[PDB]
Amino acid sequence: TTCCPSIVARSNFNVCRLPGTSEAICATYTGCIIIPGATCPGDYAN
């Protein structure tokens, strides 16, 4: 599951994913994170 720190970061993550880029590369590029669970924390609410 991906969790993003702001709405900007989420929007940038979604563009990064359009060509098929790995989630892990899009995470370091945007500041979003990948967790094994389904419950994003409050500081990664977007």
Author numbering: 1 to 46
Show sentences the authors wrote.
Crambin is a small hydro­phobic storage protein of 46 residues (4.7 kDa) found in the embryonic tissue (cotyledons and hypocotyledons) of seeds from Crambe abyssinica, a relative of mustard and canola, commonly known as Abyssinian cabbage. Crambin belongs to a family of small proteins called thio­nins found only in higher plants and was reported to be membrane associated. Crambin crystallizes readily and forms the best-ordered macromolecular crystals known, which diffract X-rays to the highest sub-atomic resolution of any protein known to date.
The structure was determined with synchrotron radiation using 31 keV (0.40 Å) X-rays and refined with independent spherical-atom approximation to an R factor of 0.0591 using SHELXL, resulting in the best refined macromolecular structure at RT to date. The structure shows only minimal radiation damage as indicated by analysis of the electron density near the three di­sulfide bridges present in the structure. While there is crystal-to-crystal variation in the relative amount of the two different isoforms, the structure presented here, determined from a single crystal, refines to approximately 64.2 (16)% SI form and 35.8 (8)% PL form. In the final model, 14 residues of the total 46 were modeled with more than one conformation, with conformational variability primarily involving side-chain rotamers. The ordered part of solvent consists of water molecules (see detailed discussion below), and only two molecules (one partial) of ethanol (sufficiently ordered to allow modeling). The number of water sites modeled in this RT structure is 73 (i.e. 75.5% of this expected number). The most prominent patterns that can be discerned in this network are water pentagons, formed at the hydro­phobic interface between several symmetry-related protein molecules. Dynamic solvent networks resulting from alternative side-chain conformations and shifts in water positions are revealed, demonstrating that polypeptide flexibility and formation of clathrate-type structures at hydro­phobic surfaces are the key features endowing crambin crystals with extraordinary diffraction power.
